[PDB]
């Protein structure tokens, strides 16, 4: 029995949200199911329930824009959410809400992996990347640090690697940080041997899906030599 | 009908045995819920009805309580025991959950290692300068980064960031970034970054001049 969620990944604003639940190992029919958001800074959020009974058990403080449905032809159930502000930006989880016919309400026991859905106007666009070269000024002892800005992108997310995947050792891919321009930015470094430095060639590979950018920077150091 | 978790952070070495407690606004008898929330994956469900340990998973996870009061202990701390808990009540709707709390490891304090990264040339050609200062495998998390431009304190031209402890030397690391036009940037010549943490008895600052 699984569960798989699927829907935009960024949905502008006062516009209608549609996110929907794959199931798997199990008929939609015979279960209640659940979907619950996480607004990054805040915690959880019970949305609503969807039941066989098509009863009504939403949260009131959305209450007013939300809808939950069930396709049995499709085995899915989805979550329908007008309006949509910056307020509804988060990560939305659907589960199996478990409950036992004497007994009552159990827990929230199969949960999806989740998707984040950002309300933003800004258009796709494709990250900039600019190396963090090492220098004098980023070396201590036998290590120096390097690595790439990726500027001006959305939305998330991006991947890094760096050498194909070949160096993972110290390497550090910070999370992103949203600019009044609207657009991402985030940085990921390494710090490797000083020596090696002339020798080993260093290449970030920057990697957004969303505008199928796909750039590899190398990373040469920057010194008076 | 509210739920309220406590600690809302808690640090522990691998193998105590630590306790997170829940407290509700009202009576609610047994139903309660634990989670684990490990970013990347999806949630999981350790215990329900308070007590009743979730199938699969490690009896060094266990729940009491009834009423008001719930308490979710965990013996022996592993690796993967460090990450966000929620309990959440079942009694009616709405259901809640509690505010969770973040568990993370605890070790010796270290001061970060600070580099600094002017722009880059190729960056310079659009006309917007990004300083970048990175403050590298440090701990406790806490740390503040003021830049400086010519002495003069920044304010509101910066944005930061700081990765999740680390798996391996429980260390945090911080990547912050000045923000300023091509002009404006060709204008000064020193970009200091000042850095805050208790591992520095005082504030250091690494800076460079602009093209030396």
């Known amino acids: 029995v699984q569960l798989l969620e699927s829907g935009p990944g960024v949905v502008k604003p006062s516009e209608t949200l549609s996110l929907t639940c794959t199931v798997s190992?199990?008929?939609?029919?015979?279960?209640?199911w659940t979907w619950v958001r996480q607004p990054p800074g805040k915690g959880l959020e019970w949305i609503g329930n969807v039941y066989d009974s098509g009863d009504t058990n939403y949260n009131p403080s959305l209450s007013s824009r939300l809808s939950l449905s069930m396709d049995t032809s499709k085995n899915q159930f989805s979550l329908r959410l007008s309006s949509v502000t910056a307020a509804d930006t988060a990560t939305y989880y659907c589960?199996?809400?478990?409950?036992?016919?004497?007994?009552?309400?159990?827990?929230?026991?199969?949960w999806g992996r989740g998707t984040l859905v950002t309300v933003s106007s800004a258009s796709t666009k494709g990250p900039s990347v600019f190396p963090l070269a090492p220098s004098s000024k980023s070396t201590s002892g036998g290590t120096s640090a390097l690595g790439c800005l990726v500027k001006d992108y959305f939305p998330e997310p991006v991947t890094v690697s760096w050498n194909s995947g070949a160096l993972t050792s110290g390497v550090h891919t910070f999370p992103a940080v949203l600019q009044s321009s609207g657009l991402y930015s985030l940085s990921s470094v390494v710090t490797v041997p000083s020596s090696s430095l002339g020798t080993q060639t260093y290449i970030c590979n920057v990697n957004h899906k969303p505008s199928n950018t796909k750039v590899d920077k190398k990373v040469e150091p920057k010194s008076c030599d | 009908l509210q739920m309220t978790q406590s600690p809302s952070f808690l640090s522990a070495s691998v193998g105590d045995r630590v306790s997170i407690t829940c407290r509700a606004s009202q009576d609610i008898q047994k139903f309660l819920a634990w989670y684990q929330l490990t970013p990347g994956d999806a949630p999981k469900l350790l215990m329900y009805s308070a007590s009743t340990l979730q199938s699969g998973v490690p009896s060094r996870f266990s729940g009491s309580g009834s009423g008001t009061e719930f308490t979710l202990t965990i013996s022996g701390l592993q690796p993967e025991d460090f990450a966000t808990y929620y309990c959440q009540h079942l009694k009616r709707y709405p259901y809640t959950f509690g505010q969770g709390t973040k568990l993370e490891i605890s070790r010796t304090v270290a001061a970060p290692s600070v580099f600094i990264f002017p722009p880059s040339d190729e960056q310079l050609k659009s006309g917007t300068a990004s300083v970048v200062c990175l403050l590298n495998n440090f701990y406790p998390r806490e740390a503040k980064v003021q830049w400086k431009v010519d002495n003069a304190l920044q304010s509101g031209n910066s944005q930061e960031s700081v990765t999740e402890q680390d798996n391996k030397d429980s260390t945090y690391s911080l990547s912050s970034t000045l923000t300023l036009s091509k002009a404006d940037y060709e204008k000064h010549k020193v970009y200091a970054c000042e850095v805050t943490h208790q591992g520095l008895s005082s504030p250091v600052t690494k800076s460079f001049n602009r093209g030396e």
């Open positions: 589960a199996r809400y478990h409950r036992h016919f004497i007994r009552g309400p159990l827990s929230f026991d199969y």
């Open positions: 190992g199990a008929s939609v029919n015979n279960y209640y």
